[PDB]
Design a protein. Structure first.
Lengths: 35, 120, 112, 120, 112, 120, 112, 112, 120, 112, 120, 120, 112, 112
């Protein structure tokens, strides 16, 4: 969009989000981290 | 997946009461948990949620500030501590295992609940 | 009561009955998946349908769901006496702070 | 939901003043907070917002760069740091808990306010 | 002073009085929801109406609101002496950097 | 990298059986491990994963609550404890070394497997 | 079996054949990387392709693949008698509790 | 080699010569800090730049660099005959098991 | 800070060879160490890391299972034991002292290097 | 005094009362076990509860308690006249040099 | 288990006073000991600890350098040597037997206490 | 608590010098110690730390390999042995008692220091 | 210097002055607690503030401070002639091998 | 009764019967080695298993066992009539003053 309205917008809901998977996500590197 | 509840009974208004949901058959620490309640003769009302690691807690507006939800992962147990019980809090409380589908979540396994009555 | 449900539905064994669940732009037409629960007179609610159309392996194909706009639905075909129960829909209302919202609940009476 | 303002007083111009609000009755970390103010004889003016985790900070253009908003979740406390106070900054400052409806938001709970006067 | 409000409104106890709130394409006709707050003389503004028509359970159903185009309003029916207060509308202006904008406020006097 | 399974055999339903996978050629303690199974005529089914430090475990829904996964780093060995065997558990069980790419993971090295038959 | 594959494919030596997987918004169109495994009649699966296009140094440039939308694919060029095998997709379905999901599996027959 | 460097750069004494280092989403665009080493014809590599912009007190202020997106770069100003050397970039690739990864190195030739 | 390589030379493939570095000028026990190598005509390749207390070790994929890294803190000495040397292992091997910056690490001090040749 | 206790609690015989003990990240939420002591007016403190939930065989099951977050609590059921006593909590504070820290102490008055 | 305090009394400030506990009913040499004190009208304050073998001693910040804790296992006796007593040191002093649970410790057996008054 | 330093003076560059800090008023064996220095006209530079049991030592990069920190618990004394003194090492050296708060540490008690001058 | 402090601050007796200490993501915004020391012209520094807000019992409530983001601050109220001193901040830089890092110190002059 | 054991287990000759032993973080998951003893009705216990998996030369290979997490177990295969006996587990509880703790003990009944 050549004329998108730039910047960070106000007018959003600033109150965490009680609609998310509360379970452990079994999709992460299970290996030791060499860093 | 078995969910077992205990702790109901009757107390005068203003008193506190603690409920406990014991679990077995699954890894407790990998799941979040929910409490809902059903006043006699009424439908279902969501009460609270706790994340698998205790990092988040949410409460229904009607109980927020009076109820506390917590976990003891080492004993596979979910707790609900109700302070300042009111007459309106009379209900069968049930625990449930959190599940999530895509854009919204759901409970899959349910306990049998216990009855909490609030009356002099 | 967030999601609107009729208080009662009925039909004779062998008939088809439906239970509706109507929301609005904040809960069903909002794109949030709708779920259904079944409660028998002396038990804890059972998951009947999840994800609008999917169901647990413990549910016979007599039950199915649907979703269109703000209207969600549960149909029961091959109605049996054993289906007398309270059926509830469930979704997420983006205007509320809670994880789940429930509908009023519909009691299904099978006309034995 | 109780919000309690503290920290008003009289400020020689050019000096700073730090305001804060203590909260109870709800989980502080689950909500965003707002500051608003009302100069005597004037209507309401929005001053600043801070997100539940500090991820965003927005200010009224009339105070941006002079005022800073911050939080300490472990103390259930919201702070407003006002530097280089001007006469025009005289107002009762209030806290409110952020809320949101659909296409726009609102505050639901309010405190009582505290007065900051900037004068020689 | 983004949304326009009359400086004053009044009427006899029992009568209906209204407070308008007029904006433009940037803040009412903009699709934003209008909210109302009531301030008593020595305290904080309190939420009266939200979501254009909804209200906290602590509000008597004597108050209501509505909107159309760039217009919005608050009506009080059955006006009582205790309704004397400063009423403010609130919205979000698409052209401004702030989360909230306020109207100028209206002072309601009950002619008891 | 050599992965070797052991412990299959024929067990009546309701009884238990324990499998293990001996490893060499790599540092066992730096990697997570997986078990998968293949019914004799079907494709592959994921069974379980254990994290490199033993802190997390996840199970397929079809075996959760009946199977346990564990490791002994000092023996470079991965174990799978299967309780309450059902006829449906007949399969070749294989161990594999966990690997991870970007948004999802994979197994890179595989063992040969061992056969577990559950039958009267 | 959340990844659908044809049960069988075939062709003569020297020909080009393809094997493919079809997923959906929860597994392939979800941005999760697709992997492929090869199983010969009396052994364990061998990693053939990882990361949608990468492959172990033990795999000749005969095999290649892709990812587009909810589709994924394995192409085999210069088909040899030695390619008779079972090929499988693997990915991650965000709706399930398990780390990996597999497709049904496709058997490739070389018409020697 | 997961970081790409040109094999050779050059310039006359006094000119400014830059050596690029291009990675991808797993290493530079992933936020891992980029480091540079200098190797002279018969010795061990010496740390030249660390932390993308910092340098040991033993390095002339002729050497500097930057990081942007998946790109990184070493700029050498005031090129001297003594700068003939092999320069290498180093980072961390989250897809690999090793702590460090290197580019292939760039030889800087001073056209004396 | 001195790091001094020793133990290079030429061996037939299949033979073992042991390299080491003596260090001085810093407290050896407080830092982790790295080995890197450079085949003639080639760039640098990371080979292995050992943690300051010897608790963790990581190896390049091309050498894991053949090379062992170790250290004796009381002798200020870092060792690398190579088994089954292959022709492809011909390289100059270097010691480097581990350092870490923010999101990634680096070596700061380097030794001089020693040459290991594998040939029949 | 680093653990916070109310200075006084009370109730009639037959009542249930609780005594709180609140700390922070240095001494309760820190993972340190909370202990309780009972002091009668003319003697030395007696261990009442240890290990947050356990108790000496000399203590009747009228006294019990638990700990969560940064708040520990002693519950007394079946309050007797004999329970008038000073109750103290105890923990370890990682910011201090001492092995034990105590709360202020709460006096329990039984309203006979 | 008996712990019996002795040696209390009253001194002008600046003077020394020595307290002790005779013990019986348990093996003194196997347990660490604590001293605590309670000023009249005040709560409990920890003063000092001595390890079972005398290897470690710790003191409250307010008394370190003025008080010395010691023991003589051959006489089953615990001692506390207080030098430079201040008015502020007026309190009932008690012995307690060290016990330890998991992440923190506790005293299980307590003595009767003795009163030390410091006054001019 | 009192920390007393002695051992400064002036030396030619390249020479060694041993400083020490004698302590009283606290149990030396229970606390770690620090040295810091302040060149005339300059701010403070941390120099070194020694653990309560001597098991760990850390040094500022500017002095590591030239300075040694040590202690002798039986004489309540902290030592700093400086080798290869440079002109740049001219400073007032101070000892301090280690203290630690939560996420970082601090010194609480300080000695008065001693002056070391390194010059032709 | 690791932490940045202004070299000088001043004011008349009775005034309030502040001394800043600004770090970054590695030292203050990193979650490390900030400490302050006071040095009088002919002696060793004294701990003034510890733990960002706490202070030794030997320090009057004239001195207080705070920490927010990467900026720490020492506030001195009721400035007296006797406060002339050098004030230093201290924290821990996770990028360095030393236990403590200091700012350059600020000299406070009281304009008697 | 520190360690938990079933009071009774059984099986027919030739069958496999196992005896569990469950502790906690104080005595099995604590890293303490688990030992087993066999007691016949008219004598003293005999060491059966030591070091979790090892056994005396006086024990036939019919008895074996292992330890994992907080669980421990004695397996008896090829059950004989002679195996009717009481089996006990033993460990060390870090919260208690005694060197050894025992489980309740399990009686093995052979269904002859």
């Amino acid at each position: 969009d050549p004329n998108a309205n730039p910047n960070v917008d106000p007018n959003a809901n600033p109150n965490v989000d009680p609609n998310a998977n509360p379970n452990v996500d079994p999709n992460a590197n299970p290996n030791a981290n060499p860093n | 997946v078995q969910l077992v509840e205990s702790g109901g009974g009757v107390v005068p208004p203003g008193r506190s009461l603690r409920l406990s949901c014991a679990t077995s058959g699954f890894t407790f620490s990998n799941y979040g948990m929910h409490w809902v309640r059903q006043a006699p003769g009424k439908g279902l009302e969501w009460v609270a949620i706790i994340w698998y690691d205790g990092s988040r807690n949410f409460y229904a507006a009607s109980v927020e500030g009076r109820f506390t939800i917590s976990r003891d992962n080492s004993k596979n147990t979910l707790y609900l501590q109700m302070n300042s019980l009111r007459v309106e809090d009379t209900a069968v409380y049930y625990c449930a295992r959190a599940a999530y589908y895509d854009t919204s979540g759901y409970g899959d396994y349910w306990g049998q609940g216990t009855l909490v009555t609030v009356s002099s | 009561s967030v999601l609107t449900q009729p208080p009662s539905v009925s039909g004779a064994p062998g008939q088809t009955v439906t239970i509706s669940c109507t929301g609005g732009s904040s809960n069903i037409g909002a794109g949030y998946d709708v779920h259904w629960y079944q409660q028998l007179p002396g038990t804890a609610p059972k998951l009947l349908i999840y994800g609008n159309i999917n169901r647990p392996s413990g549910v016979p194909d007599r039950f199915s769901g649907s979703k269109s706009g703000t209207s969600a639905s549960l149909a029961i075909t091959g109605l049996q006496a054993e289906d007398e129960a309270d059926y509830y829909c469930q979704s997420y209302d983006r205007r509320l702070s809670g994880s789940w919202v429930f509908g009023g609940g519909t009691k299904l009476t099978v006309l034995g």
